[PDB]
Amino acid sequence: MALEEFLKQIREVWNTYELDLVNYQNKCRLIRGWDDLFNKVKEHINSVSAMKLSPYYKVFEEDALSWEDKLNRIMALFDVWIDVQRRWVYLEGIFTGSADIKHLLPVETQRFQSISTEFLALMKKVSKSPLVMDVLNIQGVQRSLERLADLLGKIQKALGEYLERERSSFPRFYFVGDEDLLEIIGNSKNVAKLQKHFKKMFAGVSSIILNEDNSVVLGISSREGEEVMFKTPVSITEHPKINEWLTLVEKEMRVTLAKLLAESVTEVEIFGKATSIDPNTYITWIDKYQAQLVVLSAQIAWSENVETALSSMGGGGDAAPLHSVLSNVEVTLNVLADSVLMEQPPLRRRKLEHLITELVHQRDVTRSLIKSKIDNAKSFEWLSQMRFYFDPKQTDVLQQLSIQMANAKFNYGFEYLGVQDKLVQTPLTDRCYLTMTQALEARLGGSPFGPAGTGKTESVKALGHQLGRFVLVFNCDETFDFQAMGRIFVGLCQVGAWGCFDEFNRLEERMLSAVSQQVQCIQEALREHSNPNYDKTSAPITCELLNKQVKVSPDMAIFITMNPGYAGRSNLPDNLKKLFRSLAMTKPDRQLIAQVMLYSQGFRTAEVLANKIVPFFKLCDEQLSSQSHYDFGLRALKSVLVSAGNVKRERIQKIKREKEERGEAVDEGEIAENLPEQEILIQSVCETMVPKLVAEDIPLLFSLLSDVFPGVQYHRGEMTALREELKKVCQEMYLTYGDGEEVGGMWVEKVLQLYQITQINHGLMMVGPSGSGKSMAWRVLLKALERLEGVEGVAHIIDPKAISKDHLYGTLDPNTREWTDGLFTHVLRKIIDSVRGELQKRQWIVFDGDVDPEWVENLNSVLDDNKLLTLPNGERLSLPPNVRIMFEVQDLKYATLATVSRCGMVWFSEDVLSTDMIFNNFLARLRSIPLDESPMLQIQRDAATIMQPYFTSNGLVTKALEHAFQLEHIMDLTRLRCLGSLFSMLHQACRNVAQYNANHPDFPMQIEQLERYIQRYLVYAILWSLSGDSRLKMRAELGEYIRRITTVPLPTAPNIPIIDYEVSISGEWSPWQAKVPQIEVETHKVAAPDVVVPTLDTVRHEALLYTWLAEHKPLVLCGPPGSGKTMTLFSALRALPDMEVVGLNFSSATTPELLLKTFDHYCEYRRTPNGVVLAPVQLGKWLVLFCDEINLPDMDKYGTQRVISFIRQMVEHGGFYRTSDQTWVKLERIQFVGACNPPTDPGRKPLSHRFLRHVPVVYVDYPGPASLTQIYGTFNRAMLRLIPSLRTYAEPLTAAMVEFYTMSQERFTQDTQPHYIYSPREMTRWVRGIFEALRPLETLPVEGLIRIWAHEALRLFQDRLVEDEERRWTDENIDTVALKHFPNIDREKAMSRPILYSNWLSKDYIPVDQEELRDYVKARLKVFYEEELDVPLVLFNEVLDHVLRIDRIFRQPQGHLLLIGVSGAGKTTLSRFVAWMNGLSVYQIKVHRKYTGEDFDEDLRTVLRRSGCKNEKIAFIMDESNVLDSGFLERMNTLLANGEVPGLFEGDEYATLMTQCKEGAQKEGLMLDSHEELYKWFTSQVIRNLHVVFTMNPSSEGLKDRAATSPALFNRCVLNWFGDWS
Amino acid sequence: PAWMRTLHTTASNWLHLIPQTLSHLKRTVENIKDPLFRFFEREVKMGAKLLQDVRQDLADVVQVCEGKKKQTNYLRTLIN
Amino acid sequence: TSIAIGSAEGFNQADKAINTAVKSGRWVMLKNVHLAPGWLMQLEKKLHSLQPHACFRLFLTMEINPKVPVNLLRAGRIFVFEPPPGVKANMLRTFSSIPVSRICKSPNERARLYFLLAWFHAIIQERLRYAPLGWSKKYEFGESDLRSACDTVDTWLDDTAKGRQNISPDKIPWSALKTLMAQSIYGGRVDNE
Ligand SMILES: Nc1ncnc2c1ncn2[C@@H]1O[C@H](COP(=O)(O)OP(=O)(O)OP(=O)(O)O)[C@@H](O)[C@H]1O
Ligand SMILES: Nc1ncnc2c1ncn2[C@@H]1O[C@H](COP(=O)(O)OP(=O)(O)O)[C@@H](O)[C@H]1O
Ligand SMILES: Nc1ncnc2c1ncn2[C@@H]1O[C@H](COP(=O)(O)OP(=O)(O)O)[C@@H](O)[C@H]1O
Ligand SMILES: Nc1ncnc2c1ncn2[C@@H]1O[C@H](COP(=O)(O)OP(=O)(O)O)[C@@H](O)[C@H]1O
C-alpha cells in the first residue's frame, strides 16, 4: 500500500504548494522559485512512473493516471509562463523607462500596454489565490499564456530600430545580440540581472561590484575573482540611464587602472635598482596590484633601468651598468622561481607565472644587449625592442605610459583584461610584434599567415593585451558578407577595439573585394587621425560605413589571420592585400615555449624536460604510423605542458595529504626536491596521446618514451569508483563489461580514456570505424558520471550534415538584417541562458555525422581557447565550462589540420568491440526484453538457450561471418549489417514460435521441436543474412562452407543448395519449390502490374522481406533495374495489411526536403509530454516510405549524401530536427524501405557504412532463362486462350520472346548508350502488347501472331536504338529468331518489312497498309491545318512510323514519351498532331526570361487540376530548353513516376484542390469525403489522363546526366530516337 | 577499339615493369627499440600497400581491355 | 569615383556613379570587375548605347581571367600590367612612380638611398622569375613592399638627420633599415630559412 501512501503525499504537497510571489516595483507580484517547482514536478512524475512499474499500480492506476495528466499540465503551463514573465519584465523596462520609444514606435507601445494590462490582470488573479491547482484551474489559462507569449514575441521582434539606436548610444552594445540587449535595457533598474552580460562587452570585466542599495558602482570584477576598486565610484541614482552610467563605469575603469599603475610603478621602483629583494615585500606588492598591472610595472621598471644604463654607457669608454640590470633581473627571477616552488593561491600563482615569463624575456633581451656590446640608447638593437616609458608628470593619467617599438608609439588603452594567459615571448612573437607594430604605425592592418598552430591568433591577442586593447576575435566564414563586416567595423570603430578576423580567406572573393572599400576608408580615417594638425577639440574623425558617418577611435585596428595553404580558399584581391602588412608565421619556437612554461610552472629540470619533450614530439610525428587523426604540433605540446603543471600540482597536494595523515611533517622544499618531474611529464604525455593511438602505434610510442625518458614508467590510475559505476550502467544497459584482458576490457579502457579526455579538452573526437562502440562508450560514460558525481547529464546529438549549414548555425536575413538561430546556435544559447538550470548540468553536444571543413571550421574559435561561437551579426557566445563539444565520426579524411589540432582524440578500433560482445548483448536483450512489448519471454529465453552454443567464440556464426567476409557482395560488407539482419531474423523465429503456440493452445511447442526449429532457422538466417546481398554463386559457396563446418542437420539433396530450403514450423527442412505452384493466370489479368507468377526467387525474397518488414526494420533491395525489386516488395507488403506504402523517387537533386514534404502530406506532428511526435494520420497503420533510388542523390566533394544522412539519423536515433523551431521530432509508426541499382552502375554512389549498418540488403537479380521461361510461358498460356487455334503455339512463342530478349540484353549494353537497359519489363510490355492486339480478334492464323510478335519486338527493342547498324541487327535477328522457333510459316506474309499496326482505319488494332495509312494521315492533316495548326508537313515513311508510335503511347495509361532527336525534326508538331487525333489537349509552358520555379509549380497545378479534377486528357509537351533549374526536373520526376507531386498543393491550394476533387468525384458518381480518398482518386485520374511528352536533343553527355538527374525519364517514359532525318 | 588495345598494351608493359612482391617487416621485442627499424617498417608497409593496390588496379584494367570483366565507376575513372 | 565590385549595393553604386559621370564628365573606376562576368556583360551593353561627356572615363581594373566576357574586351582598350621585363625597366618604373619632390629632400643622401632601394627591388623582382633558383617560391614582392621601404627610409633618415643638408654615411641608420626590411617589409612574406 506504499503506492497509496506516496499518492497521498503528492496530493498533500500539491494541496499545500503555493506559487512564491514577490512584488515587482509595486506593479504586480511576479512568480519566484521556478527551480523548486520544476524539480518538484519532475520528481513527482518520476515517482508516478516508478509506481507504474509495480503491479499493485493497477488498483490505483486510473487515479495515478489522472495525477500525471494534472502534473503534465502544470509543467506545460510553467514551461511557458516563466518565459512569458521574463519577457514581459524586460519589455516593461523598455516601454516605461524610455520616453523616446512612444514617439518613435507608438503602435506596438499601445499593443504592449494592452498585453501588459492582460498580464497584470492575470497576475492579480494569481495573487488572489496563489494555489498552484487554483491557477491551473483557471479557464483557458494555457491558451492565455501561449497567446501572451506569441504577442510578446511579435513586439520583441518589432524593436530592431530602437535597439540599433541604443547601440549607437553605447558602442559596446554592438557586441550584444538583440535578445541580450533587450534584457539589458529592460533590466536597467535591477542591476543583478546584468552581471551575466558584462563578459560580452568588456575584455576582462565579468561582473561589477555594487553597494547594498545597488545604486553606486564601487568597482569591477573578473571571472577569476580579481577586483578593481574605483577611485571615484559611479552613482547609478545620479545617472539612471543604462548607457550613461555604463559609459561612466568604463571611463572610471580606465582612470582607476591608470592611477593604480602609477602607484604600482612608484612602488616597484624600489625593487628595481636594488641588489637584494625581500621575497615577502615582493609577494605583498604582487598581491596588492592586478596581474596586468604588476606585469606592466615590471616592464616599465626594466625598460627605464635599461635606458638609464645605456645613457650611462653612451660615452663608450665608460663602465657597463647593463650588468647591474641583468643582475637585478636575475635576482628577481630567482625570487619568482623560489616563490613558484611552494604552494601559492591560484591568482598569485598566475601572477607569478606571468612575471616569470616576462622576466625570462627581459633576461634574454638584456643578455643579447650585453653580448652585442650596446652602449647607445639610440641603437636599433635597443630601439627594436618593446620599451615602456612612464611620465608621472603628465597631467592626463591615460597618457602617462607610452609603449614604443622601433618608431611606433602607442598609448596603453587601460582596458581591464582580467588575468589573461600570457604567451612566452619567443623570437617569432618578437618578429610578429615588430611587424604588426610597424603596420599599426603605418595605419595598416596586420596579416600573420601560415600553417595552423603557429601563434597567429594568439600573438595578435598577446600584442593587443600588451598595449592594453580590447581584442575581439571573429571566426570568419562565407556568411560574413559586406553588411555584416561593415556593422562589425562600425562597432569596432566606435568602441576603439582590435578586430582579429581569423580564417579571413573563408569569405567569398566578391565579399573580400567589397570589404576592401570599408577597410580602406577606415584606414584613411585613422591616418587623418594620426596627423598632428588634427585637434580633438574639432569634429571627431568619422568615416563612411554602411552609408553612415561613424566616429573612428584611434585605438581601433584590424588584423586578419589566414592559412593560404588550404586548397579551395578565396584569393584576396590585390587592392585588399595592399591594405595589410603580412608576416609568415610558420615555425614556432617550441623549445623555448616549453622551457619557459615548465620553468614558470615550478619544474626544477625545465631545460632538460623541454630538450627531452620537443624532440620526443618530433619523433612521434616522424616515427608513428601516418593517421588522419594524429596531431603532434604546438596546440598538442601546450596541451601536454598545461596537463603536466596540473598533474604536478595534484601530486604535490596528494603528497601533502599523505604527510598530514601519516604523522605531522610537511616541507615544501623537501617535496619539490624529491619529486619525479620525469614521471609527471610522461603521465601527461600518455594521458594526452595514448587515446588517439592505433593498436600498432602504442608499443612504438612506449619504446620512444623509454628511449627519450629511460627509467620512468607510466602506471595509469585505477579509477575504482568510476569502474563500478560503468559496470552497473553496462549491466542495466545489456552491455558487456570487462577488466583488463577480459571480454570488453579494451572497450572499458576506451571509455576511461574518453573520461580522461573530457577533463582536459572541451572538444573531443571519437574516431573509429562504424560499429566500434563509440556511441555506447560515451552514453555509458555520461550515465556513469551522472550516477557518480550526482550531476545530471544531458546530451544533444546533432547530425551536422543532415541539415544545411544555414540550418545548423543560423541565417542573417539579407533584407531586414535579422538573425535566425540555427540548431547548434539555438542549443548553445539555450544552455548559456540557463532559464531552466542548464548550467548546473553536464551538457554534451555530440556532432554525430560526417566532418568536412565547411561546417566544422566555424567551430575553430569554440574548440580553441577563445571558446567563442562567433556569428556574422557580431554576436559572440561564450562556451560554458560545463559544456563539451563532441564529434562522433567514422573517419577524418576530409577534416583539415586546424580541426584535428583543436580537439582531443579517442581512437576506437573494430577490435575494441569484439563479436563476442555483440553476441552477449543480443542474447541478454533476448532473455530480458519481451518481443511483444510472459509466454513470449519464456519462448525468447528457451530460444536464447538453444542458440547459445553457436553464439560463442570460434562458433558457427563467427566462422560463417569470417568466411562470408571473403565472398563478393553487391554492397560493402560490414559486421553489424549482417549481425543486425541475423538478430532480426531470430526475433522473427521467436515470433513464429509464439504464433504457432497461439494457433495450437492445447498442444504448444515442446523442447525438442523448439530446438530443431531454432537450429535449422539459425542456419537459414545465417545463409540469408551473410549472403543475402550476393549472387547465387556466393550463396552456394556460403552454403557449402556451412555444410562443411556445421553440426546442425541439413538437407540431404545431392546438388540442391541449402538456400533453396526453408525451415517449417515443424522443425524440418522443406524445399522452397513446394511453395511454387504452376499457376494459371486469368486472361484478363495477363501481365498486369500487380500480377506475380510465383518462382523460387520470388517466394524466397517475399519471405525474407516479410521477415524484415514485420520487425519494422529498414531494408534495402539492390539489383539491376527491372529485376523485380518493387514487384517483390509490393507482393511482400500485400501480406501485411496494416502497412501503407508511400513511394518516393530519389534523384541526384534529392534533399531531405522531399521526405519532409511526404511527412507533411501523410503524417502529422503532435505535442506530447515527451516532446513532438510525428505519426501517420491513419491510426494503427505503419507508413512504409519506399525510396526507389536511394544511392542516386548527389554526393558532395566531401563524400556525403545529405538525404542519406537524414535517413540514417531517423533510423539510428529514431527522429530528426525541425529547423523551424529546432525541435527534436520523434518518428512513430514509420519505417523505411529503399531500392537501388548496384553502386558500380553509372551515377550510383556507395552508401555510407554507418547507414548500411542499420539496413539489411537483399540482392534481387534478373530472373534466369528458366525463370523467364516459366513466368512468360504462364503469361502466354493465359493470353493465347483467347484464340484456341493458337494455344499449341504458346510454348514456342515464349521461347522466341525470351531468346530475342536475351540476345538484345547481350548485344546492347550501357557501354554503348546510357539508355540501353533491357529488363523483364520489356518482356512484360511484350506480353501486354501481344495481348492487347489479340484481345478484340476472334480468330487469327499463326502468321498474324508472328507479325504481332515481330511488331512488338520492333517497338520495344528498336525504337530506342541510336545507330542504323543496331536497327539492322535487330531486324535481322527478329527474322532469324522467328524462323528458328516458328518453322513452316509464310515468311513473306508475316515478315513484310513495313510492319505497321494501327486502329485508325478500323475499330480494332490490325495491320495497316502504308499507302492507306498515308492517305488517311493526309486527310487528317488537312483537317488539322484547317482547325488547329496551319503548318504544312511533308509525309514520308518515318513520319508514319513516328505518328503510329506516338499514338500507341498516347493510348496507354500513364503513357509518357521521351522523343530524342535534332531540333526541327517535327517531334513537337507530330506530338501535337497525334494528341489532336486522340483528343488530348496540348499543354506547353510559356517560358520567358522571368520564368521561375513558382511559375512552373503554378503550371503544374493547372495541369494536374485539369487532368485529375476535370477528367480532361492532357498531353503535356515539355522541351529540354524549358528546363531552367533542377527543381523543374525534380518535380517532373516525381510527377512522371508517381502521378502526384507531394508538396505541390499546400495551404489554401490544397483545400481548393480537395473541393474540386470532391466535385469531380460527385460528377463521376463516387462517394468520397475523406481527404485521403480524394487525393487517391485525384492521383488515379492524373495517372489515367496526363501524358507527358519530353523532347530533347541527342546530346552525348546530356543523356548520361539526365539518366541520373531524372531517372523516371528512362523508366516511366517510352524512349523514341527520332534522330536526324535519314 | 584502338584506345582499348593501346591501354591493354600499356598496362601489360607496366605490370611487367613493376615488381610483384614486398614482404612486411617482422616485429620483434628488440627490433622495436631500433629507430631505423621503426622507420623501415613504415617504409615497407606503405610500399607494399601501394604496390598491391597498383597491381590490382592494373590487373583490373587488363581484364577490362580483354572484355572479361565489366566496367565499374572506379574502373571507368581509372581508365579515363 | 572608385567602387569595388562584389556586392549588390556595389552594383547600385557603380550604376549611379556611371550615370552621374557620363553627364558630369568625371572619372569612374571599378575594381575587381572579373568577379561579376554577367554584370560585366550588362555593363558592356549599357556602355555601347551611350553618349557620355567628352571628359568621361571608365576604368575597369581586373586580373587576367578567362571569365571576363569577350565582348567587353573588344569594346574597351586593354592595358596589361605585369612585372617589368628587366632590371633597367624595373628601376625606370620605380623612379617614375616615386615623385621627384620626395627624393629631392633636405638630405643629399636620400637620393642614393632611394637608388639603392630601387636596385634592391629590381634585383629581387628579377630573381622572382627563376622560381627554384632565384627564390624558393613566387613571393609577392610588389609595389606595396617598395612603398613601405621608401616610407621606412624617409622616417629613419628624417629621424637621424634633423633637417640637415648633408649627413655623413656613417651616421645613416643602416642597421634600422636592414633589420626592418629583413624582418618586416620584405622578410614578412618570406617563410623559408
Ligand atoms: N560494451 C559493449 N558490449 C557489447 N555490445 C556493445 C558494447 N558497446 C557497444 N555494443 C554494441 O555494438 C554495436 C556498436 O554500436 P555503437 O553505437 O557503440 O557503435 P558506433 O561506434 O556508434 O557506430 P557508428 O559509427 O555506426 O555510430 C551495437 O550493437 C552496440 O549496442
Ligand atoms: N609563444 C607562445 N607561447 C605560448 N603558447 C603559444 C605561443 N604561440 C602559440 N601558442 C599556443 O599555440 C596554440 C595555437 O596558437 P593559435 O594562435 O591559436 O594558432 P593559429 O595560429 O593556428 O591560429 C595555442 O594554444 C596558443 O596559446
Ligand atoms: N515472377 C514474376 N512474375 C511476374 N512478373 C515478373 C516476375 N519476375 C519478374 N517480373 C517482371 O519484372 C519486372 C520488375 O520491374 P519492377 O517491379 O519495376 O522492378 P525494379 O524496381 O527492380 O525495376 C516487371 O515487369 C515484372 O512483371
Ligand atoms: N515532315 C515535315 N514536313 C514539313 N515541315 C516539317 C516537317 N517536320 C517538321 N517540319 C517543320 O518543323 C517546324 C517546327 O519543328 P518542330 O516540329 O517543333 O520540331 P522540334 O520540336 O523537334 O524542334 C514546322 O514549322 C515545320 O515547318
Short mmCIF file of N, CA and C in Angstrom, two decimals, chain A residues 846-886:
data_model
loop_
_atom_site.label_atom_id
_atom_site.label_comp_id
_atom_site.label_asym_id
_atom_site.label_seq_id
_atom_site.Cartn_x
_atom_site.Cartn_y
_atom_site.Cartn_z
N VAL A 846 27.03 16.40 -29.04
CA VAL A 846 27.70 15.37 -29.83
C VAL A 846 27.35 15.58 -31.29
N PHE A 847 28.37 15.87 -32.10
CA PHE A 847 28.19 16.07 -33.54
C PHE A 847 28.35 14.74 -34.28
N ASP A 848 27.34 13.89 -34.13
CA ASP A 848 27.36 12.58 -34.76
C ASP A 848 27.06 12.70 -36.25
N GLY A 849 28.07 12.47 -37.07
CA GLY A 849 27.94 12.57 -38.51
C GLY A 849 29.29 12.82 -39.14
N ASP A 850 29.26 13.19 -40.42
CA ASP A 850 30.48 13.44 -41.18
C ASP A 850 31.04 14.82 -40.86
N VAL A 851 32.36 14.93 -40.93
CA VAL A 851 33.07 16.18 -40.67
C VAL A 851 33.75 16.62 -41.95
N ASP A 852 33.44 17.82 -42.41
CA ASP A 852 34.12 18.47 -43.51
C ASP A 852 34.45 19.90 -43.10
N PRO A 853 35.45 20.52 -43.72
CA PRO A 853 35.85 21.86 -43.27
C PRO A 853 34.73 22.88 -43.33
N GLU A 854 33.79 22.74 -44.27
CA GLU A 854 32.79 23.78 -44.49
C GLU A 854 31.96 24.05 -43.24
N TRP A 855 31.53 23.00 -42.54
CA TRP A 855 30.71 23.20 -41.35
C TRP A 855 31.51 23.24 -40.05
N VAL A 856 32.61 22.49 -39.95
CA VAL A 856 33.32 22.41 -38.68
C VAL A 856 34.35 23.52 -38.50
N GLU A 857 34.81 24.15 -39.59
CA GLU A 857 35.74 25.25 -39.46
C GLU A 857 35.10 26.48 -38.82
N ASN A 858 33.77 26.53 -38.74
CA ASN A 858 33.10 27.57 -37.97
C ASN A 858 33.29 27.39 -36.48
N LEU A 859 33.74 26.21 -36.05
CA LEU A 859 33.91 25.89 -34.64
C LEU A 859 35.34 26.07 -34.17
N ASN A 860 36.19 26.73 -34.96
CA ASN A 860 37.59 26.89 -34.58
C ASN A 860 37.72 27.70 -33.30
N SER A 861 36.98 28.81 -33.21
CA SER A 861 37.06 29.65 -32.02
C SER A 861 36.44 28.96 -30.81
N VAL A 862 35.44 28.11 -31.05
CA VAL A 862 34.84 27.34 -29.96
C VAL A 862 35.84 26.32 -29.43
N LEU A 863 36.38 25.51 -30.33
CA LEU A 863 37.22 24.39 -29.88
C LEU A 863 38.65 24.88 -29.62
N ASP A 864 38.86 26.19 -29.64
CA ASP A 864 40.19 26.75 -29.35
C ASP A 864 40.20 27.17 -27.90
N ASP A 865 40.77 28.33 -27.63
CA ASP A 865 40.86 28.81 -26.24
C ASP A 865 40.09 30.11 -26.20
N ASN A 866 39.50 30.45 -27.33
CA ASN A 866 38.62 31.64 -27.33
C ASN A 866 37.30 31.12 -26.78
N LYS A 867 36.98 29.85 -27.01
CA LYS A 867 35.71 29.26 -26.60
C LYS A 867 34.53 30.18 -26.92
N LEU A 868 34.54 30.73 -28.13
CA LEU A 868 33.52 31.67 -28.58
C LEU A 868 32.90 31.17 -29.88
N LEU A 869 31.57 31.16 -29.93
CA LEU A 869 30.84 30.93 -31.17
C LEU A 869 30.55 32.29 -31.80
N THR A 870 31.40 32.65 -32.76
CA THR A 870 31.28 33.94 -33.43
C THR A 870 30.26 33.84 -34.56
N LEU A 871 29.27 34.73 -34.54
CA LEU A 871 28.23 34.79 -35.55
C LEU A 871 28.40 36.03 -36.41
N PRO A 872 27.91 36.00 -37.65
CA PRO A 872 28.11 37.16 -38.55
C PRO A 872 27.47 38.44 -38.06
N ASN A 873 26.46 38.38 -37.19
CA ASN A 873 25.80 39.58 -36.70
C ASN A 873 26.56 40.25 -35.56
N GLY A 874 27.83 39.90 -35.35
CA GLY A 874 28.62 40.49 -34.30
C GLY A 874 28.44 39.87 -32.93
N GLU A 875 27.58 38.86 -32.80
CA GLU A 875 27.34 38.22 -31.52
C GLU A 875 28.39 37.15 -31.25
N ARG A 876 28.81 37.05 -29.99
CA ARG A 876 29.79 36.06 -29.57
C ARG A 876 29.24 35.33 -28.35
N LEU A 877 29.15 34.01 -28.44
CA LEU A 877 28.59 33.18 -27.38
C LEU A 877 29.72 32.43 -26.69
N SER A 878 29.91 32.68 -25.40
CA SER A 878 30.98 32.05 -24.65
C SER A 878 30.58 30.63 -24.27
N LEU A 879 31.49 29.68 -24.49
CA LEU A 879 31.22 28.29 -24.14
C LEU A 879 31.26 28.12 -22.63
N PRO A 880 30.19 27.65 -21.99
CA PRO A 880 30.22 27.47 -20.55
C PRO A 880 31.19 26.36 -20.16
N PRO A 881 31.75 26.41 -18.95
CA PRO A 881 32.72 25.38 -18.55
C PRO A 881 32.13 23.98 -18.45
N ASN A 882 30.82 23.84 -18.34
CA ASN A 882 30.19 22.53 -18.21
C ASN A 882 29.80 21.91 -19.54
N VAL A 883 30.12 22.55 -20.66
CA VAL A 883 29.71 22.10 -21.98
C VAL A 883 30.90 21.46 -22.68
N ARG A 884 30.69 20.27 -23.23
CA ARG A 884 31.68 19.58 -24.04
C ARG A 884 31.15 19.46 -25.46
N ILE A 885 32.00 19.77 -26.44
CA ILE A 885 31.67 19.62 -27.85
C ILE A 885 32.30 18.32 -28.33
N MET A 886 31.46 17.38 -28.76
CA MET A 886 31.90 16.05 -29.11
C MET A 886 31.62 15.78 -30.59
#
